[PDB]
Enzyme design. Structure first.
Site, mmCIF file in Angstrom:
data_model
loop_
_atom_site.group_PDB
_atom_site.id
_atom_site.type_symbol
_atom_site.label_atom_id
_atom_site.label_comp_id
_atom_site.label_asym_id
_atom_site.label_seq_id
_atom_site.Cartn_x
_atom_site.Cartn_y
_atom_site.Cartn_z
ATOM 1 N N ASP A 63 -1.949 6.469 5.845
ATOM 2 C CA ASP A 63 -3.016 5.592 5.390
ATOM 3 C C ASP A 63 -3.372 4.628 6.525
ATOM 4 O O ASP A 63 -2.689 3.615 6.730
ATOM 5 C CB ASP A 63 -2.512 4.811 4.186
ATOM 6 C CG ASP A 63 -3.598 4.016 3.488
ATOM 7 O OD1 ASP A 63 -4.689 3.778 4.056
ATOM 8 O OD2 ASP A 63 -3.332 3.621 2.343
ATOM 9 N N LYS A 90 -12.882 -1.856 6.364
ATOM 10 C CA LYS A 90 -12.127 -2.792 7.199
ATOM 11 C C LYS A 90 -12.453 -2.681 8.684
ATOM 12 O O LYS A 90 -12.780 -3.688 9.313
ATOM 13 C CB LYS A 90 -10.622 -2.621 6.941
ATOM 14 C CG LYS A 90 -10.336 -2.859 5.460
ATOM 15 C CD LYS A 90 -8.958 -3.318 5.012
ATOM 16 C CE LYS A 90 -8.892 -3.002 3.496
ATOM 17 N NZ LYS A 90 -7.683 -2.287 3.238
ATOM 18 N N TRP A 150 0.799 -1.223 0.000
ATOM 19 C CA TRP A 150 0.000 0.000 0.000
ATOM 20 C C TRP A 150 0.831 1.271 0.000
ATOM 21 O O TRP A 150 0.492 2.238 -0.685
ATOM 22 C CB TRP A 150 -0.990 -0.008 1.158
ATOM 23 C CG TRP A 150 -2.020 -1.085 1.001
ATOM 24 C CD1 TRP A 150 -2.223 -2.164 1.821
ATOM 25 C CD2 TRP A 150 -2.970 -1.203 -0.066
ATOM 26 N NE1 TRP A 150 -3.241 -2.945 1.321
ATOM 27 C CE2 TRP A 150 -3.716 -2.383 0.169
ATOM 28 C CE3 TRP A 150 -3.259 -0.430 -1.200
ATOM 29 C CZ2 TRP A 150 -4.737 -2.804 -0.694
ATOM 30 C CZ3 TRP A 150 -4.273 -0.851 -2.058
ATOM 31 C CH2 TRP A 150 -4.998 -2.029 -1.799
#
Lengths: 360, 360
Positions: free
Chosen positions: A172, A196, A100
């Site tokens: 993030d 999530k 990511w």
């Protein structure tokens, strides 16, 4: 009986889904669904205001921070961050320690020249990340970006940022937000896809420090412009109403169960139970350094990969879903987010012990 | 008993919501919700493939068109269109005939200098739109943009585009798509926020002619890049899964009831019944030319505005919700989308006659 270990979209609190299901066609005695009412009606405006309030209380977000609800998911922010807080500068620092973090760097190249810093190291054959005090930031960077939780690698950087007042930190938090208490004041921007730990897919939450607003690039689509979202209370255009409403129920569920402090304790037990079983086994293995082990995403591998298929068939039959690892890394992976109860992690570990005993 | 005339988010087919409610916690015998499974799992990938297929059948979308499912809503496309199909050119033609058409022009200024064409005309004191043959397109333009259905004004341009093979037409079908049959081959880009006729808010559908791909601006966020979305089957990042699934049920609902041809016929009956009541009364009035009257959004004013509040109080009490007009225009407005049954439009008109007969 069924435990879903999906990495995202993921399991939502059972309690929350019971409520959503029950009110799906008649919400608030209105005789209509939350999905069928106007986002500008008083009924929904109140749901949106409560959600923001609850979220701010949960993480203790200071008054100098704006909380925005938007479209685009986490990857939408890979573009929104540079488009919003780059200003007149042409470089930003990006710390790479996983998939990511690297994906963010790729998107950033469309807007600037990112100075990449590889923080990955292998200590004792185990995958770890360099301490922040060793990270090399540049002099004229607009901000520094990093990812505290990599879902594919099972790597986490829990360390609290402590750079100068001159450094703007963007992070993030998609797969770890609300799992433990964090000091929001240390950051400039915190963003997270909801699918999530917050709610369903289709909504993204962004926490921006006030003074960072007002310098968006003119090429930034208005729906991604923090200033425009802020000015319009995240309602510049029709927002994903159902997702915002479900996220609100999740925040209430968190508050009802002790907030982020209690969540942190339960997540600690869940992780310890699982990593304990993996570490004590000759059959299962995790190659991440203790200091960087994620409590949300736990990747592991069987000593004999020829048993992978059988592990997935039997685990599924025992009511343990989505245990297969990411397409890029193979192996197995158990995502144990906030919604996942300790009884679920216990059911998994029990199965792992029994499987090793029968085929190990 | 309760009829919701909300303009968007709007009412969803009752049968579709019954199904979504029943399967909310156990979809496909998986023991989990559609919201809790991975978008890369075999199950959801099938839902996504059928949704696209059903949609293509419904509107007869040719093979040379790509159907994309994305984030951002209609206002996300006001930016996406210029960012994707402008190419080397620095100008594009924009036809202005209402609020949405004008909003698109405002966003387009961030990417090019749009040649605006005011198509608004007042014929016989009634608001109308100039025929397309009279629209002035420029030589140098990348494309021509217009909005066939203005939700605030209650204006519709049903005329089929028939410009040269060298004119690329981009259109905002947010509030009218699937209400009547259209010739997709006449367009370059057709986009529509789902919250009006397709599904819940949070999802946008885009129909792009293939040869228009491959020339996106480098500043275009990847989540809005048509090429990237196409290459990844609209799954470059996590899509709004629940919204996509609900949209899929809506397409099946349309097919089960005769498709777009039957929908067109019922929408004709609904509009005629309502406009008939308005036109035969002195108490209610609509000032839009018959030729440009929208069948989806029907705005109307009371002869005596001092009765506005009483009209809303009593209509709400009779189970008729969201009849208030847009803030910008005032007055009343009944949005009668595909999901709205004729019985619902009859209940409204019955109330309108009784109210006029009692306070007129």
């Amino acid at each position: 009986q069924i435990f879903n270990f999906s990495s995202g979209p993921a399991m939502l609190p059972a309690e929350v889904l019971k409520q959503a299901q029950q009110e799906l066609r008649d919400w608030n005695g209105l005789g209509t669904s939350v999905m069928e009412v106007s986002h500008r009606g008083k009924e929904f405006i109140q749901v949106a205001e409560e959600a923001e309030k609850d979220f701010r209380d949960l993480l203790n977000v200071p008054s100098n921070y704006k909380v925005l609800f938007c479209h685009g998911g986490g990857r939408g922010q890979f573009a929104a961050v540079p488009l919003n807080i780059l200003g007149d500068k042409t470089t930003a620092d990006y710390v790479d320690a996983g998939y990511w973090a690297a994906s963010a760097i790729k998107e950033a190249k469309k807007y600037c020249t990112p100075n990449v810093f590889d923080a990955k190291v292998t200590v004792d054959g185990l995958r770890a990340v360099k301490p922040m005090r060793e990270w090399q930031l540049s002099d004229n960077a607009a901000y520094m970006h990093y990812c505290p939780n990599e879902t594919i690698d099972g790597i986490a950087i829990d360390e609290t940022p402590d750079f100068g007042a001159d450094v703007v930190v963007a992070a993030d938090f998609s797969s770890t937000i609300l799992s433990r208490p964090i000091d929001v004041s240390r950051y400039g921007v915190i963003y997270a896809g909801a699918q999530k730990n917050i709610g369903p897919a289709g909504l993204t939450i962004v926490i921006v420090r006030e003074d960072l607003l007002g310098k968006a690039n003119i090429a930034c689509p208005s729906i991604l412009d923090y200033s425009i979202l802020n000015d319009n209370g995240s309602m510049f255009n029709t927002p994903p109403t159902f997702a915002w409403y479900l996220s609100g129920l999740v925040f209430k569920w968190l508050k009802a169960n002790g907030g982020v402090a209690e969540m942190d304790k339960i997540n600690q037990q869940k992780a310890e139970l699982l990593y304990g079983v993996i570490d004590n086994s000759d059959f299962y293995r995790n190659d991440v350094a203790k200091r960087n082990r994620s409590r949300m995403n736990v990747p592991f591998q069987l000593a004999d990969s020829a048993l992978d298929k059988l592990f997935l068939e039997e685990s599924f039959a025992a009511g343990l879903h989505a245990l297969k690892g990411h397409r890029v890394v193979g192996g197995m992976r158990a995502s144990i987010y906030n919604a996942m109860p300790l009884e679920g992690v216990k059911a998994l570990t029990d199965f792992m012990v029994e499987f090793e005993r029968r085929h190990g």
